[PDB]
């Protein structure tokens, strides 16, 4: 029955000549601009509340004269660490690679219009809409905070070795971490450090968070290291999108580059000893589907991974 179904779906598998008749069903509620509005209480801020705005009033093309955002900067960011930009954003060049202490920082947004600079204060304005809050908040860098996400995937397999199949498509499985700050499951990843590229950041954050190898667990056996290097040598950048992260403000927003490491055979993924470390509590293999409740816009990232791999979602 399994082969008959598999051979049957291997046969009748499949913008011009395309018609949408959903307007007959819904009516005037066919499509709406369902943009992102962050929650009212800023995370880890001690009860500081934003200026509430409706989702239909957010884009920068719209005027909106009744706009009084709150200026908030976190004490950790205001203490000036190595990964935080100065509080006065003058002399900083946006939309090009800028050198801070001889280290390269990206500073380029994936928005087609680009980043516009305010004449009064020199601070950047977010092109993806209004968020009801100025200042940097919990984010250390003015403007675009580059994040790298690592989606390490394998086919969801039964003990007999056959891949699980739902809705006529093969089912994926990704490594998911439970975040320390807000206890929601998420894709491993982190902010891009100064002087580093997406390759190093993606690999380093996956090693630190999902495996816990960042000076805290033990040294890997060194035959296992070759397997992990083999896994990391074939990665495809699937998306570079704007994050729906609740820490985003008008002067600092997170934008992610997503790197997918797919294990076709499943041999290298099975040798990974998952153990949450650094800013991750627990790490586990989790089935990819459309009903997942993950942190920020990681569902969109998983949608892009399944779109690229022709997997179930």
């Amino acid at each position: 029955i399994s082969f008959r179904f598999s051979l049957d779906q291997q046969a009748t598998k499949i913008p011009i000549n395309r018609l949408n008749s959903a307007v007959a069903v819904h009516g005037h509620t066919a499509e709406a601009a369902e943009w992102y509005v962050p929650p009212e209480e800023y995370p880890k801020s001690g009860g500081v509340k934003r200026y509430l705005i409706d989702a239909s009033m957010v884009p920068l093309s719209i005027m909106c004269p009744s706009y009084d955002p709150v200026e908030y900067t976190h004490p950790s960011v205001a203490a000036q660490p190595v990964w935080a930009d100065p509080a006065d954003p003058r002399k900083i060049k946006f939309n090009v690679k800028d050198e801070v202490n001889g280290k390269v920082v990206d500073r380029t947004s994936c928005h087609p219009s680009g980043i516009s600079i305010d004449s009064n204060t020199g601070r950047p304005i977010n092109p993806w809409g209004r968020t009801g809050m100025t200042g940097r908040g919990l984010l250390g860098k003015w403007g675009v905070n580059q994040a790298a996400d690592t989606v390490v995937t394998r086919w969801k397999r039964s003990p007999d070795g056959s891949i699980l199949e739902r809705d006529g498509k093969k089912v994926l499985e990704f490594v998911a971490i439970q975040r320390q700050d807000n206890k929601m499951w998420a894709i491993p990843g982190g902010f891009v450090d100064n002087g580093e590229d997406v390759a190093l950041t993606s690999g380093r954050e996956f090693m630190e968070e999902a495996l816990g190898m960042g000076t805290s667990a033990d040294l890997m056996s060194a035959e296992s290291k070759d397997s992990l290097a083999a896994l990391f040598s074939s990665g495809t950048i699937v998306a570079r999108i704007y994050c729906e992260d609740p820490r985003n403000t008008d002067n600092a927003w997170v934008e992610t580059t997503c790197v997918n490491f797919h294990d076709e055979s499943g041999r290298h993924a099975a040798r990974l000893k998952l153990q949450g470390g650094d800013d991750a509590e627990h790490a586990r293999w989790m089935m990819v589907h459309g009903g997942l409740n993950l942190f920020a816009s990681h569902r969109t990232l998983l949608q892009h991974v399944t779109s690229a791999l022709n997997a179930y979602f």
Binding site: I1, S2, F5, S158, D160, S162, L164, E165, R166, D167, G168, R284, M286, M287, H289, G290, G291, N293
Partner: protein
Amino acid sequence: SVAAKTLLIENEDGKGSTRMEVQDFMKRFHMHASEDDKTGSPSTAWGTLRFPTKEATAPYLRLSVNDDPEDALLFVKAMLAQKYGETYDRPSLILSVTGGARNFTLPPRLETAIAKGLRLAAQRTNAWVVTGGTNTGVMKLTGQIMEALSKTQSHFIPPTIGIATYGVIIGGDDMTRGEPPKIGLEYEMHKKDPPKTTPLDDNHNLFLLVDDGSTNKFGKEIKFRAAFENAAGQAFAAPVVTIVVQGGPGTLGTALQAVRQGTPIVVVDGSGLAADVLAYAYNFMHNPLTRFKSYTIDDLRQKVAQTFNPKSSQQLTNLLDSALECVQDPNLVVVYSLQESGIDEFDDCILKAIFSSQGKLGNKLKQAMYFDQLDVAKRALSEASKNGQHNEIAACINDNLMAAMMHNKPHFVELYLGFDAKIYELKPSEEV
């Protein structure tokens, strides 16, 4: 009878029990005068209840949500230790029965089949069955099963602990006010209390009334029930098996807490409602058999909406997310089918749930010996033999052979003797 003035609580070291006054031990249990209260007041609601047509009395303790479950476990151990002596029969299985209480309507054949499996498992393993404390649905049915079980036993009677939220009980007001040692207080199930309408089950042997300063609110005892079973499971080194028959939203929460605390669950498919939702979710996420390739998240969402009635998209998202979070770990959920598979395979599902845990390997071999499944024990030993594991096997083989002799299982005796157990290096449990 003369009221107890001192009680024997087993020490935290697990080496002996020390005797201390009841009010000193009992000071650690709290109650809430109102919802707003956090620190609390001394409990003052503990004792024994006398039910009509029941010879023995059942102890009750009203405690707060913030109380340590180990302390409640010590309370249950201290009463059993007081009544039956220090060397009472320890449980090798904790069977938690949860599910539908009001709208628990089922065909008679399904009950009898679950009842037969539950009765056999309970009688073979001397299990402690923990259900809710009320006189409704599957808990009341389970109470009838252990009522029939309570007659053929001669000395040791396994407790039927009922954990219920205080505030819904019609005899709740009478029990709290008064002299703290209440010996044999009469419980009136037919008496009319205007705000509360749910009575206690007369067949349960012990009662834990969990309090949070609320009235007529359900589902407040779920976290404590999962934590108490997990604490009991660690203390007696016995696997905890939750069984899910029908159920509403709180049964979903019970299963969620159970899977979060590491306790395996056995979901009875074909009984309808929340069990069908959980079984559908598990079969969609893990089962590679062919019938389940047309399963979708949309049909699952439709099932959650048709069963639970969430009335909003965000509520539907939280229930659906919770249901998917229950069946995330395939080892912790075991699905029993009362309409597809065989009649005598429910104990195999319970044993598979026992076998799915991480530790308590000697107890797992003992559990396999109780259910008379040699093949399961043989496969576990063969896997251990292939996986080296010589240290863990040598430490537990002697006690298992000893246990097999005590419970009269000769096939298990020959099996354990074949797996490198020297006959003269057998050791007794107590010290002479």
